[PDB]
């Protein structure tokens, strides 16, 4: 797999550094000279180029990349023109970072395979942690079911798993308990719940909220 | 709970809209007139103010907010001077959006309770999906254990749960299977695995990668 | 018919002045204060507004206009987001002025009913007059047939229509002859051809060029 | 014929590409480095130069060109100083693209052989098509007579030429009928008029409008 990342910002530069860490061939393209010099050591190849130009895009050998990530999310004109060129060049996978709702609609029309909202998705996840401080990290399996990594309270100290009627009353299944950097995978009844550490739970979205308030 | 969000960007405006959707009192503060007019309907109170000024900050009644989120991640001077004022005003919870590694170190010194990297965290999660297309969304329970929502392949079609020796060989536990918008919570042996839909699994980080390659 | 012209440039301001001359209700929208003040007397209604904003676009009553002309041809971001909003608002006819080939392709994707190249079409017509000074104005009926308003040469002076074997040899039909501000519609054989005045001809594109060189 | 085009914009670059297509020697002059690199392949010779400088203008051998086209229509100072130099250098034909009415008056004073308004002429032609949707393209032979390429309506279907009394009542002559990419030159009575395709007509300006309303 050969990856090309166009636009070395906070979001684009993180993809370059992570893919280079995993041992992947990454082409880092940016119009800024200082950005390319900073990410020259964090990419297989770093080029100072304008992606809105077809002649400069063909000089990179961009047709040899299966995945191209257009991480420009503040210039709609630069973002939409780039993916119009890549779609014309028959790139199998174009992932674009969008800015707002209207930018999302343009990229969907001109054939962007996946459209990403990094700050919008994180802001929704952060606002869930602000509203309820008991949660630490959650993953939405669907619109009604989710896996929530809860934080243990003071009332849950010295409590066994069989004491908590999550399976019967709340209809939720405890998945894993982490104690002081040691994680217990699929605990069996019964285990004593320690102080304020991680507690992974799975259930309906409304059912987990009932467990937090009651227990 | 009263929340104040300072800086209505892509990240800050998403927290305002999500907290207002949940029914929370949100104060939206921005130095830009156009940003405040756009988010006036998505916040309980929207004020055009400079947060680096103590006199303007005290005019907002900012001492009445338990949570203040400083969502300025491109102006380090504006971000660090705001949280210095809020720390001086004894705000119990200050959550700051950082820009790079050096901005993270300054905010840790001047007393930021939680420091957030929205684009850096999403770029790491996106790069995991680029490297392995079988994964869809994952949550890191620890540095060695994670819950990965896999995507079913063609070889897993018409296969039962008991046929897959994930519990014995791979040491991984299947958590939930979603079929065409219908999610089965904690499936029992045995269930037929359908076509390319969601498949939630839990196990060691290295053990899940073995399951993807072999099966 | 109610027309809205967005962008009062050299091209947009000409549509406003011509439609207002014919007695049509024209809404002139521009983001520049000086442009609106200049065209306030040449439009039924002139508003200073940003067309990329949906709230400002709905304040104009833009849903009441059958034809909206987006005459912005130097800002691709402003041009493509305006027509995305108008397409979302179900405007029956959206005519957009494009900048280059790539801007033409974006507007075709997001549903522009007619795309106009004013300078590109005039430059092609002007370059035809530079290459052959005998022509004055031409209209392309098809890719092989055209009506060319020729200019009479010195060798065509004191020549009758029957003397010119355009119908038999060249396969071209003389349409109209203009003499000193007096235009003769469909002349009959034979009429004396005067000095260097207009001479409208119709025929194949290659056949007219043979007539110019030989006669 | 040797042509020089000064200013490679939307209008100037179209003249360069069209004249180069016809097989003419074109000198493309622009002050922008990126414009010259783009049109280097579409011109015989492309030079990065400032046309307001006499020393740079004489380095191009501009005295060897019969036609010079000054396609600068947004900088009046650059446009008027260029044609003052070319008039001083005794260029036989100087064609200048103007911006407004006052720019047209200056160029007429300092000796511009032909002054062109590309957006103003297209805006007038476009506004004629907006006012009456039956017309497609027209050419003004004079102030009272024109050739209009009409669009066939539903009431003109299955109608013969002799049925339409354009020659007797309206005083208009049908010139050519185009059917599905096939163009009939000077049709003879009688031909059946098909569905909504091109229909070229010639007559007085007021007489054609009567034909559209009645038929
Ligand atoms: N036409 C272009 N071609 C290549 N790179 C470009 C182009 N235009 C902008 N860039 C670069 O893309 C990077 C990211 O774009 P920008 O800063 O506008 O977006 P952003 O949404 O604010 O970024 P992020 O949130 O990832 O920090 C910048 O380093 C910028 O220099
Ligand atoms: N001193 C300040 N007080 C209040 N708001 C401010 C101040 N300085 C900047 N802002 C606002 O904060 C918002 C977000 O800041 P900025 O755009 O610099 O950061 P960012 O990291 O690029 O944002 P995001 O990624 O969330 O789009 C902007 O709307 C900006 O106007
Ligand atoms: N978002 C916008 N909303 C409304 N008007 C706008 C907007 N952006 C630009 N305009 C106006 O549109 C007009 C024409 O746009 P612009 O000058 O960028 O294009 P152009 O192709 O150079 O124009 P022209 O060739 O017709 O002179 C200008 O008067 C400009 O102020
Ligand atoms: N002094 C100069 N000498 C040569 N070229 C020039 C000079 N000044 C401007 N130009 C170039 O002339 C070109 C056209 O000029 P400009 O863009 O100002 O006019 P315009 O009327 O907006 O153009 P168009 O409608 O053809 O796009 C531009 O590429 C510009 O760089
Ligand atoms: Na950002
Ligand atoms: Na123009």
From Swiss-Prot, chains A, B, C, D:
Result of knocking out the encoding gene? Impaired potassium uptake.
Naturally occurring in which organism (per UniProt) = Bacillus subtilis (strain 168)
Residue ranges of every copy of the RCK C-terminal domain listed in the record:
133-215
Q: Which gene encodes it?
A: ktrA
* PROSITE patterns in UniProt: RCK_C, RCK_N
- A Gene Ontology CC term for this entry? plasma membrane
Q: Which SUPFAM superfamilies match?
A: NAD(P)-binding Rossmann-fold domains, TrkA C-terminal domain-like
Described by its record, this protein's role is as follows: Catalytic subunit of the KtrAB potassium uptake transporter. The 2 major potassium transporter complexes KtrAB and KtrCD confer resistance to both suddenly imposed and prolonged osmotic stress.
Single Gene Ontology BP annotation: potassium ion transport
- Which lineage? Bacteria, Bacillati, Bacillota, Bacilli, Bacillales
Q: Which InterPro entries match?
A: NAD(P)-bd_dom_sf, RCK_C, RCK_C_sf, RCK_N, Trk_Ktr_HKT_K-transport
Q: Where in the cell is it found?
A: Cell membrane
Instruction: Give the UniProt family note.
Output: Belongs to the KtrA potassium transport family.
Specify the protein's topology with respect to the membrane.
Answer: Peripheral membrane protein
Ranges for domain RCK N-terminal come to 1-116
Name the residues that bind NAD(+): 10, 30-32, 50-51, 72-74, 97-99, 103, 119
User: One MF term in GO for this entry?
Assistant: monoatomic cation transmembrane transporter activity
Q: Quaternary structure?
A: Homodimer, tetramer (dimer of homodimer) and octamer (tetramer of homodimer). Part of the KtrAB complex formed by an octameric catalytic ring of KtrA and a membrane associated dimer of KtrB forming a potassium channel.
Q: What keywords were assigned to this record? A: Cell membrane, Ion transport, Membrane, NAD, Potassium, Potassium transport, Transport
Protein name, UniProt field = Ktr system potassium uptake protein A
């Amino acid at each position: 797999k050969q990856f090309a990342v166009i636009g070395l910002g906070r979001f684009g530069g993180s993809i370059c550094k992570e893919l280079h860490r995993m041992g992947h061939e990454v082409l880092a393209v940016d119009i800024n000279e200082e950005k390319v010099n900073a990410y020259a050591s964090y990419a297989t190849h770093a080029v100072i180029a304008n992606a809105t130009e077809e002649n400069e895009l063909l000089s990179l050998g961009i047709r040899n990349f299966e995945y191209v990530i257009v991480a420009i999310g503040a210039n709609i004109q630069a973002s939409t023109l780039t993916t119009l060129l890549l779609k014309e060049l028959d790139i199998p996978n174009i992932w674009v970072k969008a800015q707002n709702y209207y930018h999302h609609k343009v990229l969907e029309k001109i054939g962007a395979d996946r459209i990403i909202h990094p700050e919008k998705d994180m802001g929704v996840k952060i606002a869930q942690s602000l509203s309820d401080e008991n949660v630490l990290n959650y993953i939405d399996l669907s619109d009604e079911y989710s896996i929530v990594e809860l934080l243990a309270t003071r009332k849950l100290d010295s409590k066994s798993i069989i004491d908590l009627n999550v399976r019967a009353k709340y209809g939720c299944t405890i998945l894993a308990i982490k104690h002081h950097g040691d994680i217990c995978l699929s605990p069996a009844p019964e285990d004593i719940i320690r102080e304020q550490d991680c507690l992974v739970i799975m259930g309906h979205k409304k059912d987990i909220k009932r467990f937090e308030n009651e227990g």
